[PDB]
Amino acid sequence: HHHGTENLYFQGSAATMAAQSLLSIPVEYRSQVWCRANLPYPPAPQLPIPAVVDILTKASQALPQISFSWTLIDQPPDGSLFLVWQAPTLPSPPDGMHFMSNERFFNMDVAGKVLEIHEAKHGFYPLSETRTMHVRCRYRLLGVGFDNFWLVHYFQGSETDSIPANISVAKPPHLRRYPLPDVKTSPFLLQE
Ligand SMILES: [Cl-]
Ligand SMILES: [Cl-]
Ligand SMILES: [Cl-]
Ligand SMILES: [Cl-]
Asked: Is Cytoplasm set as a keyword in this record?
């Protein structure tokens, strides 16, 4: 009466390792962790669309040799790129960023496949910023057997996009609890 949707995504025998690792985390932090690949990606400025498609395509081909950990992500620096496992019908865990506007959802046709682009401009870190300075993009490429994997990218906003920021009217509306617990799991696989 609480976890039906999550349970659908943990049916795989390789998703058994992910499930076992999540159950090792205190219940209160299970909703707070990202399932993030142990790469790490080199940081990058805003990526051209063909680069996004190649990065997700290569990740999908390398998946059996890439491990994941449940981890907290908080106030990642500009340039940060992550490969994450996430159900599209579940909310993203927190990253410490708040937004003065709604995330916009665009779809592109790429070589006959759909690339989803979830672009959240007007990002800010309320503990340290009074104006917006950051963009977060979440990408996924559909119909190539990698539907629940995302590229998540944080980068610097343009000066002209910067607007005054106030947590009282931002999304999400609540500041996360600091300091963060240490909760990073040992690595596991999502395909064998
Ligand atoms: Cl475990
Ligand atoms: Cl808006
Ligand atoms: Cl998938
Ligand atoms: Cl929200």
From this structure: yes
Q: What are phi and psi of 84, to 5 degrees?
A: -130, 145
Structural contact between residues 10 and 19, judged by C-beta atoms closer than 8 angstroms: yes
Q: Where are the domains of the chain?
A: 4-183
Q: Which of 84, 97, 101 is nearest to 139 (CA)?
A: 84
CA dist 163 and 168 (Å) reads: 15
Token pair belonging to 71: 């981890």
Provide φ and ψ at 72, rounded to 5°: -80, 140
CA distances from 127 to 33, 100, 189 (A): 21, 15, 35
CB 33 within 8 A of CB 94: no
CA torsion 69→104→145→97, rounded to 10°? 0
Ligand 3 centroid from CA 145, angstroms: 6
Cα 160 to middle of ligand 2, angstroms: 17
Query: What span, in angstroms and rounded, lies between the C-alpha atoms of 41 and 37?
Result: 9
For residues 150 and 85, give the distance between their C-alpha atoms in angstroms, rounded to a whole number: 6
CA of 172 to the centre of ligand 4 (A): 4
Please indicate the experimental technique that yielded this structure: X-ray
- Find the 76 Cα to ligand 2 centroid distance in Å: 23
